[PDB]
């Protein structure tokens, strides 16, 4: 179903422009998809919500008395 291509015997085989353009288009499309998703939806990899620090919480909202009440 293709075109006629002869063997080459120790040289670079014949290349059709169709396969080259198709491969370049597919690779460029995949890279564009990755970049577009990164731009529009960046938080899927870097995260959208900060991670809290347990040590930075002050002792009042936590419910601790200064070691003598209880």
């Amino acid at each position: 179903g293709g075109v006629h291509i002869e063997p080459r015997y120790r040289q670079f085989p014949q290349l059709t422009r169709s396969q080259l353009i198709q491969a370049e288009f597919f690779s460029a499309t995949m890279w564009f998809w990755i970049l577009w998703r990164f731009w529009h939806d960046s938080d899927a990899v870097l995260g959208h919500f900060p991670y809290p620090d347990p040590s930075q919480w002050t002792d009042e909202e936590l419910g601790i008395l200064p070691d003598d009440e209880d």
Binding site: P54, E61, L62, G63
Partner: protein, 52 residues
């Protein structure tokens, strides 16, 4: 030796699990008593969860 080491270290990892610095998940309605098993004619002990 490979099999024995794998089994022994799997047992060791079972002895020493890995987790996050969090408490158990809280569930609203008596720890979902009605929707897990049912039995609505027993009136389980009311559990109240913490606001923090």
């Amino acid at each position: 030796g490979f099999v024995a080491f794998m089994l022994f270290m799997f047992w060791v990892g079972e002895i020493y699990p890995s987790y996050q610095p969090v408490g158990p998940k809280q569930y609203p309605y008596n720890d979902l008593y009605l929707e897990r098993g049912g039995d609505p004619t027993k009136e389980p002990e009311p559990v109240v969860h913490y606001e923090i």
